[PDB]
Design a protein around this ligand. Structure first.
Ligand SMILES: Nc1ncnc2c1ncn2[C@@H]1O[C@H](COP(=O)(O)O)[C@@H](O)[C@H]1O
Ligand SMILES: Nc1ncnc2c1ncn2[C@@H]1O[C@H](COP(=O)(O)O)[C@@H](O)[C@H]1O
Ligand SMILES: Nc1ncnc2c1ncn2[C@@H]1O[C@H](COP(=O)(O)O)[C@@H](O)[C@H]1O
Ligand SMILES: Nc1ncnc2c1ncn2[C@@H]1O[C@H](COP(=O)(O)O)[C@@H](O)[C@H]1O
Ligand SMILES: Nc1ncnc2c1ncn2[C@@H]1O[C@H](COP(=O)(O)O)[C@@H](O)[C@H]1O
Lengths: 150, 148, 150, 150, 148
């Protein structure tokens, strides 16, 4: 329940006006917003974010797109956020995603797949650590914590 | 790629035209043809040519012709496959919440909407329903946010 | 009572994927769809429709705007649809528009004001004669009439 | 003009899961997110922000409240965002608020009134300077600007 | 304060119950009682006491007893006045979008829902429709988020 995950609205998501929608679905799922900001990534911020993918053929086109406009970074906290965050976002390739998920409802191409979520806790610690200073992460208690968790 | 999508008479009656169009809009697809009309007997029959041997066929044809449908064409990369996924499984009883039939329907006989099963059936229903006259050619300002 | 009105989502409304949102609003209200099409207006159509105001300084830009891409035209039928239709759209200038109306929720610029409604009965017969083949207007009965009207 | 406004989800807004809904209304309206932040104000930030109200009797409860947990600060850019942002939000006192506005749909008590928007372009510049480093402010062009502004 | 809200027979037929309940929840008010019954004629007459003078009175009474309604009772500071602001003007033609009658209704004879005029009318409508032990006593875990 101390578990955190990192979520990003990619440039296509911000451009397309989906930021509110993505945040509302995490809110209503019962997860806690703990960090939040908007920036345009430099390409080195890009390369470092996608380290897991540096060896892939699509890596430069991805780094090029990710660094091309403002993204919104966010940190979410809760029992199982990482796994659920990924469930909420739907398959990485939209073509595989079910209606009801972010990509399922909103995306068509894996190059414009709207949003990003850490694939594991560990990646999450890394991506949280990479984008936010520890001074940037608020610490609070949801008044509904006990309506949501046992 | 293009697909034919229709809201059947039960969907028009139940005020779901706007909802189904919003989900195609919000998915990134591009609307290109549009109209509302009560099909004749003939039009129903001819529309469903591929199910003439089925036993539910005449109930089907009479139902499709009892009121307005709304026909549409949507244009996009994979619209046909993706249009069917949006609508949900044909028999609502197998449809997942999140889909049109999943949120909105109970009975395969009142399953709210129709979508072309393949590109060949798509080009045929489009041409069955629309004159070239009526199909708009335009470029969405958002193409580069949706496709690579 | 009557009565029919003409609604068009204009090129900015069509580009911003607001077509369904507008239709749903007239549906939830209880009104009846009777005609529907998507077309790019020719410059001459635009002028025919904005005819009453050929002598406006803004008219040439309107005309140019209104025919720069596809609009969605509609006909709605029911007691007091003309007035009640203008109410759903909100005031012509989006700055005077209350939230909850179409323009209130979606527009900023008169001139990029998302949608048009007939200003009166007379105007609605003029607009519906203009844009629609009268032998292509559905006539059907809503299974819910006695739920919507006394 | 293109003006900027500062909007702030207060602590009750955050606790009630209303951050997404609010952001989404500014998006659908056509305005542009330019800075975003989640932090718990200090007792000193709270006075700073509400400085021109220090004399009113509720100020101490206000200030305590405002600093009782996290807020979400934002900056929005667009022609009229200040006038419009107040309109979207609704009367400061929710009892005077109309359904359709944030306070109208969501709030009951002026002391728990969900969110805050600059009362003027003058005050927006004070609020924006106060909460955001000028480099916390993205600079970017929406792909839709021509659809929203004529 | 408490008020009485009823979704009328047109509101129920048209599936607006949830919509209506959700608008009260999101505002912050606390649901305290709830039932579906078809009103008897006597019950309709009784509820509509004050309006016995009106030429529309027999229509209303026939109508309000023609199907099930949904009765509710809501609690919170200022619910009586705010309940009615959420409903919209009594005549939908005067209603603004954003309100229940503004978004959903066209005709005053089918104005979807009812809310109490005043605290005395609410206290009256609540004893008429509800027995005292149909009325739950609880405390929202959010009471502090809504009231100072
Ligand atoms: N052009 C492309 N071809 C194939 N896969 C891609 C392409 N662009 C991006 N990807 C995917 O982008 C994902 C990167 O993580 P995420 O930020 O979750 O989208 C990878 O898992 C890739 O499969
Ligand atoms: N009464 C029925 N019993 C069984 N299947 C039906 C019945 N009515 C319609 N169908 C189905 O209707 C579908 C036709 O395509 P669509 O235009 O999507 O409805 C077929 O896949 C049939 O299985
Ligand atoms: N540049 C402009 N300046 C002022 N008013 C405009 C401008 N462009 C369009 N309009 C308005 O557009 C309206 C036309 O109505 P509609 O069919 O609803 O778009 C008129 O009432 C004008 O006031
Ligand atoms: N207890 C209270 N009584 C009256 N007004 C209040 C009270 N608490 C807060 N306010 C209002 O809070 C407003 C502050 O502006 P805003 O940041 O827009 O909420 C003031 O104008 C006051 O009207
Ligand atoms: N001509 C009419 N036909 C039916 N109902 C009417 C008519 N004129 C007014 N009403 C209203 O029907 C309403 C029903 O009350 P309410 O509980 O607010 O729905 C009354 O408040 C009357 O004002």
């Amino acid at each position: 329940s101390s578990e955190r995950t990192f979520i990003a609205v990619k440039p296509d998501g911000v451009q397309r006006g989906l930021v509110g929608e993505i945040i509302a679905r995490f809110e209503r799922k019962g997860y806690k917003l703990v960090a939040l900001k908007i920036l345009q990534p430099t390409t080195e911020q890009a390369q470092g974010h996608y380290k897991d993918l540096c060896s892939k053929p699509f890596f430069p086109a991805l780094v090029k797109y990710f660094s091309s406009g403002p993204i919104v970074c966010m940190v979410w906290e809760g029992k199982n956020v990482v796994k659920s965050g990924r469930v909420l976002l739907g398959a990485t390739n939209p073509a595989d995603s079910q209606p009801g998920t972010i990509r399922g409802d909103f995306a068509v191409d894996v190059g414009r797949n709207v949003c990003h979520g850490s694939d594991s806790v560990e990646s999450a610690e890394r991506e949280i650590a990479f984008w936010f200073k520890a001074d940037e992460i608020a610490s609070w208690t949801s008044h509904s914590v006990s309506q949501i968790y046992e």
